Amino acid sequence: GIPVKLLNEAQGHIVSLELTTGATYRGKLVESEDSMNVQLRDVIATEPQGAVTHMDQIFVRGSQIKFIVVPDLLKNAPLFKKNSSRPMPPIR
Amino acid sequence: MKLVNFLKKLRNEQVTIELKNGTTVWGTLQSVSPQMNAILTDVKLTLPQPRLNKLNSNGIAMASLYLTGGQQPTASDNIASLQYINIRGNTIRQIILPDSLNLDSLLVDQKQLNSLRRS
Amino acid sequence: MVPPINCIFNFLQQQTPVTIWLFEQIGIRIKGKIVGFDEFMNVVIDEAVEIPVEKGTPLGKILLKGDNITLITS
Amino acid sequence: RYYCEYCHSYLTHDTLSVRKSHLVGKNHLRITADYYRNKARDIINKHNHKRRHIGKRGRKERENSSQNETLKVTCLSNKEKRHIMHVKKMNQKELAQTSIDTLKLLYDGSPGYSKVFVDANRFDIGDLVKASSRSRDETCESNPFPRLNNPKKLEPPKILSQWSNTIPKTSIFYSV
Amino acid sequence: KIQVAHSSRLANLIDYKLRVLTQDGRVYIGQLMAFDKHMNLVLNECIEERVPKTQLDKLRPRTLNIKVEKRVLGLTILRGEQILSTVVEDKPLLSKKERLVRDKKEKKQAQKQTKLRKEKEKKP
Amino acid sequence: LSRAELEELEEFEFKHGPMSLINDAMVTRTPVIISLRNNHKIIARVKAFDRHCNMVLENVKELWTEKKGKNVINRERFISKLFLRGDSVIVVLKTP
Amino acid sequence: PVNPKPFLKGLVNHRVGVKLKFNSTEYRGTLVSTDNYFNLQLNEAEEFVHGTLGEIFIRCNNVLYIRE
Amino acid sequence: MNYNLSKYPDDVSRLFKPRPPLSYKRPTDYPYAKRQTNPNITGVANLLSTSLKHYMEEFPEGSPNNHLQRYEDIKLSKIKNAQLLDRRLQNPNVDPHIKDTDPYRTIFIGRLPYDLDEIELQKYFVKFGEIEKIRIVKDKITQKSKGYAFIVFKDPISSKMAFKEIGVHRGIQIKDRICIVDIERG
Amino acid sequence: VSTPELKKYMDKKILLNINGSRKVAGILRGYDIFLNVVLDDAMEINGEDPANNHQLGLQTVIRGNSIISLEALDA
RNA sequence: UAAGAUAUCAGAGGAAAGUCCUCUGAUCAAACAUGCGCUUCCAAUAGUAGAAGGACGUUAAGCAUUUAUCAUUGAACUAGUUCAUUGAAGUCAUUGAUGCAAACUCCUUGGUCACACACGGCGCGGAAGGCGUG
RNA sequence: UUUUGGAAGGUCUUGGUAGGAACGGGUGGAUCUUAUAAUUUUUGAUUUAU
């Protein structure tokens, strides 16, 4: 699935979040796993009633993510190529 | 058995999907997915009026009704017509299927018979 | 490291009394001794009492369902 | 199976760690660095060739533009335009890498310069740069009087080459 | 407005500017680019549109004008759990004939790369 | 386990298990009461059911009540044939 | 030292109460049998949120705890 | 950006410029603490079971489950399958056609070509000792050769050596088919 | 499927938000594939820093269906 | 993460029950062609226009509203109010935020096609569907 | 004399014009069924409700 494979393409670039509690985190994304859970580094965190703070390191259960906003130059990374021609694999 | 495999045979029928919100969706049905992702065509999605001397209706669903971009400005009552609405399965509470069709032809699952006929 | 299923087990054998905060909707905290558990983190509580959030009735032997477990605390 | 489509190659021995040895491998990094450098310029270099919609001109405007004289156009040669596009492309590369940092040069001997401009050792960024000397301990005991044959004059203001001959020819006072 | 193909699933309508609804009553309107088994989707230049609490009395049953407060967020990856339904808004910038043309030239160009890579790997 | 093994298991849990209340209600033509997590109850006869507890019903009579500042009304909505998603239900009783 | 799955097997055809999470509603009757997912079946039940009921089935999600 | 903790060099890292921070918008849905499905679910009341009788008198006879009769057609047909098998199992010490000398002398031969004859059967099986009898079995309902025969040897050791040889040897080719051998079984 | 990699976090003081409103700070010992987590010397944070704050227990284990975020307030 | 599978149905045939395989029907689907007096849409030049969509643009500090911490101790005070001190947290904003409306400017889109200035079709396309055969 | 099908010639119209067939693999991707209704998406904690 491409939605998740894209998120790995965005390691070490600034991203946003929006947790289903209604917060908004935006800092550099260090790790991601296959369940769409992320570790952000050097973030700015906006509580649902507007209050903003800064925290150095944060982890979020992937289940609570509502969307992620990624840098706009990955819109043409090669996940999105329709007709791709892979070579013949090496024999195991 | 999967009773979602019953819905797949109910294709090109008039139907009313009725959602968890309270939003009813009267339309022409197309391919239902294995996770019950029903996909309709010539639709008309509305909210009923719970009367009781102006009890406030579903606040979230009224927003989601106008946002669809189907609600016409001079709709006096709360309705919204459009073509093609794809609906994620988990939101279906009920599906009011029509009176004409016979269940007895359709509730006979093929994989149910194909397990007994094979043994 | 100390895994949680490992550490739920160290309330079973030690016989320590625990308090278990539930889902915030319901509005009660349960407490008593955790006898035994399953793979799905649903546990049986021995000599249990239902405190609303110290006048709550005693329950007895209660199997608690693992959807409603928020905290398990000594 | 698994493969990295920047390199276009399949992994020989599939484990998790062989992936991570390929994902932070020197060959693979140079590809993915180079892949996005090509997609960067291609959105700019392939400029939007717009589609024209020609209207049938009026009887009125066709007479008012006929009395107006035809202006001369200038078309360069093929050899000329291949050079002038080599220049103008290399000029826009320069305006990327200007980064006018005179202001760091001005506060060089100030009392908090170690703590704000060195940037390995701020607070905001400082913990992040230590992962990937002029230390924070520096006070205003060392170098008490800046002007003791130490300081360099301020580098003069830059100027455009094209219009380098608009400058007044002589200075007002006699410099050394 | 736009008439979608009467039997067109979510796989077909790539590049169609969609109109996706979440559970909270917020709508993300943008060009679709991928989807998934559990229906999380990647929009390209989406805009979230919300009806504020103050405007919401105006939609209660009696031309209505609604101040929809929207904010740009380019290239999202939504989550499946949250989606409630989808609706189609616009059709793609390129034609139906022209989307076949760009496929066959790219299908030709993709095959040329492998044979030029295989013979550059074979001898050297 | 094998694919044939689960077919035996499914026939057991429908026949000799908690869902035997529904299965014995389908066969014997006995009407049921169902309570959805909607807080409104439907009085119906079952025509099929399934693993997930979803079920096709026939001659459905829904009974939904609403309140707004201690003012009550009891609404009744009749439907010919209905298909009910299975997560919505919490308690199925079988009428005498 | 009793685990949950064998705990239901002990409580077969005894008088139990099962508390749904919603309105502090226990269903008070005699258990019949159990599922893999702790779906329940009752006989001669009584609804305490007052009434005396016939034969009940309870879906798994909705249950809070099970008492004797 | 300044730091760029990424695999890429400083030029490529500055190339992925993010759109500026999201504007804040005051939320419209319910707060995550307050979120809940409808509580106060009034149970299946006695008053509800009192109002069952208005439904019960209206639809006293339920509709017939005719889709169930498609399953009651097949399962009862499988039981009737066993009874026709039960009619056969009561009917081998009788058949007359299997009731010559010792059953330890009898080879079964099977899969024999429809278009064999007893003389070619005799040739092959006489390879493993003197024959006392043959019989190919034919369908008594119309004399299609059934593809099996029973062959009584003068000694059971020659019957078991014929068995050895011409069945576990892939099946003896006779005419154009691969003929299992067994002992009598029956 | 995969275990969440909080290997760098363990033995540091960690604030985390339980469901909506409750915040619980403690020293993180162990974790599992569901993100149910266990920590030593817990303390429930509130609006008034010394007043409404009270300690929970010596060892407490949290279910991973109520973690939202988990910030590491140390190095 | 794994295993399995590559339309369904019915009939005849080959190795009493079922499986495996093959040609004959029905239904289902995809791709490709190809039709329908099929449906909808495709912008002034005989003029300085206009349609759809925007503006995260201006007028504009518009106009009309409502908002700017809590606890502890003393003085005065009516029978709540102000002043000073001690502690707790504290998105920024008040030229704001919320509601109402207009004007102007500017951006992206297209057949700015051919014939005709003529008292409820059957010009040549392109775009979007519906329906039908092969 | 007509309708239905097949063969050829003529005329109008429309599409294609460099790849296609068979066969083969411890080949790629899609879909489908089951493990899978047990906390990370789809078998319900967002109609704010007593």
Chain H residues with beta carbon closer than 8 angstroms to that of C24: 33
| Residues belonging to chain E | 124
Interface of C with I in 6-25 (CB under 8 A): 6-8, 10, 18-19, 21, 23-24
Chain H residues with beta carbon closer than 8 angstroms to that of D123: none
Is the shortest CB-to-strand distance from B115 to strand K under 7 Å? Answer: no
One-letter amino acid for residue E118 of the chain: K
What's the rounded Cα separation, in Å, for the pair E37 and A34?
A: 14
What's the rounded Cα separation, in Å, for the pair F49 and A28?
A: 50
Residues after which a C–N gap over 2.5 Å breaks chain A: none
Per DSSP bridges, beta strands G63-67 and B24-30 are unpaired
F68–B55 CB contact, under 8 Å = yes
Residue E52, C-beta contacts closer than 8 angstroms, at least 6 positions apart: E67, E69, H25, H26, H28
3-state secondary structure of E36: coil
Kindly tell me whether chain G and chain A come into contact, counting contact as 3+ Cβ pairs under 8 Å: no
CB I69 within 8 Å of CB A19: yes
CA distances from G23 to G48, G64, G66, H33, H43 (A): 10, 11, 16, 18, 9
Residue boundaries of the structural domains of chain A: 1-92
CB I71 within 8 Å of CB I15: yes
Residue boundaries of the structural domains of chain B: 1-119
Please state the separation of Cα D159 from the chain's center in Å: 18
> For G7-25, b where at least 16 C-beta lie within 10 A, e where not — what string?
bbeebeeeebbbbbbbebb
CB G14 within 8 Å of CB G68: yes
Is the shortest CB-to-strand distance from E95 to strand J under 7 Å? Answer: yes
3-state secondary structure of A6: helix
Per DSSP bridges, beta strands H131-138 and G40-48 are unpaired
CA distances from F67 to E48, E96, G50, H40 (A): 34, 54, 22, 12
- Nucleotide nearest E25 (Cα, C1'): K46
Q: For D7, phi and psi rounded to 5 degrees?
A: -75, -25
CA distances from C72 to C32, F17, I56, I61, I71 (A): 11, 32, 10, 5, 21
Name the minimum distance, in Å, from the CA of G35 to any CA of chain C: 14
What's the rounded Cα separation, in Å, for the pair C39 and G37?
A: 12
One-letter amino acid for residue G21 of the chain: K
CA distances from D149 to D110, D152, D153, G28, H19 (A): 17, 9, 11, 96, 47
- Nucleotide nearest A49 (Cα, C1'): J91
Residue of H nearest to E24 (CA): H29
What's the rounded Cα separation, in Å, for the pair E22 and E14?
A: 20
Q: How many domains in chain F?
A: 1
| Class at the top of the CATH hierarchy for domain G1-68 | mainly beta
What's the rounded Cα separation, in Å, for the pair G14 and G19?
A: 16
Helix ranges, chain D (H): 16-23, 26-45, 59-64, 78-96, 102-106, 113-116, 126-129
Is the shortest CB-to-strand distance from A54 to strand K under 7 Å? Answer: no
- Smallest CA-to-CA distance from D119 within H12, H20, H1, A25 is with H1
Name the minimum distance, in Å, from the CA of A43 to any CA of chain I: 11
Interface mutation vs chain B, best among F12, F37, F54, F58, most B CBs within 10 Å: F54
Please state the separation of Cα D24 from the chain's center in Å: 27
Q: What is the CA radius of gyration of chain E?
A: 20
The conformational region for residue F45 under phi > 0 = left, psi -120 to 50 = alpha, else beta, is: beta
Calculate the dihedral angle through the C-alpha atoms of H124, H126, H132, H134, rounding to the nearest 10 degrees. 10
HSE of B102 in the Cβ direction (CA atoms, 13 Å)?
7
Is the shortest CB-to-strand distance from F6 to strand K under 7 Å? Answer: yes
Domain that holds residue H140: 103-183
Residue F51 sits in a domain of what CATH number?
A: 2.30.30.100
Residue with the two structure tokens 């409580």: G11
Structure tokens at E11: 């796989």
H5 touching F (Cβ < 8 Å):
no
- Smallest CA-to-CA distance from E67 within E53, E83, E86 is with E53
| Rounded CA–C1' distance between E27 and J51, in angstroms | 27
Structure tokens at B66: 């106008």
Consecutive H or E run containing B48? none
Structure tokens at H21: 């921070």
Question: In DSSP terms, which residues pair with E17 in a beta bridge?
Answer: E31
What's the rounded Cα separation, in Å, for the pair E60 and E66?
A: 12
What's the rounded Cα separation, in Å, for the pair G4 and G59?
A: 17
CB A87 within 8 Å of CB E114: yes
CA distances from H154 to F76, H102, H105, H106, H131 (A): 90, 9, 7, 9, 6
- Smallest CA-to-CA distance from C32 within C18, C22, C50 is with C18
What's the rounded Cα separation, in Å, for the pair A36 and A4?
A: 7
Helix ranges, chain A (H): 2-9
> For H2-35, b where at least 16 C-beta lie within 10 A, e where not — what string?
ebbbbbbeeebbebbebeeebeebebbbeebeee
Name the minimum distance, in Å, from the CA of H181 to any CA of chain F: 33
Contacting subunits of E (3+ beta carbon pairs below 8 A):
A, B, H
Is the shortest CB-to-strand distance from B73 to strand K under 7 Å? Answer: no
| Residues belonging to chain H | 186
Chain H residues with beta carbon closer than 8 angstroms to that of A26: 21-22
| Rounded CA–C1' distance between E32 and J134, in angstroms | 36
3-state secondary structure of G1: coil
Domain that holds residue I34: 1-75
Residue with the two structure tokens 């258990």: G31
F35–H43 CB contact, under 8 Å = yes
Interface mutation vs chain C, best among G3, G12, G19, most C CBs within 10 Å: G3
Chain A residues with beta carbon closer than 8 angstroms to that of E34: 1-3, 6, 79-80
CB B91 within 8 Å of CB F87: no
CA angle, corner D140, sides to D134 and D146, nearest 5? 90
One-letter amino acid for residue H70 of the chain: R
CB I25 within 8 Å of CB I15: yes
What's the rounded Cα separation, in Å, for the pair G23 and H41?
A: 6
D40 touching H (Cβ < 8 Å):
yes
Is the shortest CB-to-strand distance from I64 to strand K under 7 Å? Answer: yes
Chain F residues with beta carbon closer than 8 angstroms to that of G41: 17-18, 20-21
Q: How many domains in chain I?
A: 1
Structure tokens at B81: 């017509």
| Rounded CA–C1' distance between I43 and J129, in angstroms | 64
Residue boundaries of the structural domains of chain G: 1-68
> For B87-102, b where at least 16 C-beta lie within 10 A, e where not — what string?
bbebbbbbbbbeeeee
CA angle, corner F74, sides to F73 and F78, nearest 5? 140
Please state the separation of Cα H54 from the chain's center in Å: 50
Q: For B43, phi and psi rounded to 5 degrees?
A: -100, 165
- Nucleotide nearest B48 (Cα, C1'): K47
Consecutive H or E run containing C10? helix C4-12
F27–H40 CB contact, under 8 Å = no
F65 touching B (Cβ < 8 Å):
no
CB H115 within 8 Å of CB H149: no
Is the shortest CB-to-strand distance from H39 to strand K under 7 Å? Answer: yes
CB C50 within 8 Å of CB C30: yes
Residue H20, C-beta contacts closer than 8 angstroms, at least 6 positions apart: none
CA distances from C14 to B84, C18, C34, D75, G7 (A): 61, 11, 10, 93, 20
H41 touching G (Cβ < 8 Å):
yes
Residue with the two structure tokens 């909270």: E24
Of chain C, the end-to-end C-alpha distance in Å amounts to 19
Structure tokens at F89: 């239900």
Q: What is the resolution of this structure in A?
A: 3.6
H43–G52 CB contact, under 8 Å = no
Say how many C-beta atoms besides its own lie within 10 A of residue B85's C-beta: 24
Chain B residues with beta carbon closer than 8 angstroms to that of H65: 104
Residue of H nearest to A73 (CA): H16
Which residues of E spanning 33-52 put their CB closer than 7 angstroms to strand J?
47, 52
- Smallest CA-to-CA distance from B1 within B117, B119, B114 is with B114
- Nucleotide nearest E47 (Cα, C1'): J56
H18–A46 CB contact, under 8 Å = no
Which residues of A spanning 12-51 put their CB closer than 7 angstroms to strand K?
20, 35-37
CA angle, corner H68, sides to H64 and H74, nearest 5? 140
CB H128 within 8 Å of CB H153: yes
Interface mutation vs chain E, best among B28, B88, B92, B93, most E CBs within 10 Å: B88
Name the minimum distance, in Å, from the CA of H62 to any CA of chain B: 14
**For A1-92, CATH number?**
2.30.30.100
Say how many C-beta atoms besides its own lie within 10 A of residue G42's C-beta: 24
Which residues of H spanning 38-77 put their CB closer than 7 angstroms to strand J?
none
Structure tokens at B30: 């197309």
| Rounded CA–C1' distance between D147 and J122, in angstroms | 97
I63–C1 CB contact, under 8 Å = no
What's the rounded Cα separation, in Å, for the pair H4 and H72?
A: 72
Structure tokens at D120: 């390995």
Domain that holds residue F54: 1-96
B30–E89 CB contact, under 8 Å = no
CB I15 within 8 Å of CB I28: no
CA distances from C24 to C18, F96, I21 (A): 18, 38, 9
Residue C16 sits in a domain of what CATH number?
A: 2.30.30.100
G4–C37 CB contact, under 8 Å = yes
CA distances from I44 to B98, D129, H142, I50 (A): 55, 34, 91, 11
Residue H139 sits in a domain of what CATH number?
A: 3.30.70.330
Helix ranges, chain B (H): 4-7, 59-67, 103-106, 110-116
What's the rounded Cα separation, in Å, for the pair B61 and B66?
A: 9
I6–A59 CB contact, under 8 Å = yes
What's the rounded Cα separation, in Å, for the pair C19 and C72?
A: 6
Residues of C with CB under 8 A from a CB of H: 24-25
Tell me the DSSP string of chain H.
Answer: -----SSS-HHHHTTSPPPPPPPP----S--TTT---------S-HHHHHTHHHHHHHS-SPPP-HHHHHHHHHHHHHHHHHHHHHHHHT---SSSTT-SS-TTSEEEEES--TT--HHHHHHHHHTTS-EEEEEEEE-TTS--EEEEEEEEESSHHHHHHHHIIIIISSSEEETTEEEEEEE---
CA distances from E37 to A83, E8, E40 (A): 20, 17, 8
The DSSP letter of residue D59 is: H
Residue A61, C-beta contacts closer than 8 angstroms, at least 6 positions apart: A37, I35, I64, I67, I68, I69, I70
HSE of A62 in the Cβ direction (CA atoms, 13 Å)?
21
Kindly tell me whether chain H and chain I come into contact, counting contact as 3+ Cβ pairs under 8 Å: yes
One-letter amino acid for residue F7 of the chain: E
Question: In DSSP terms, which residues pair with B46 in a beta bridge?
Answer: B24, B79
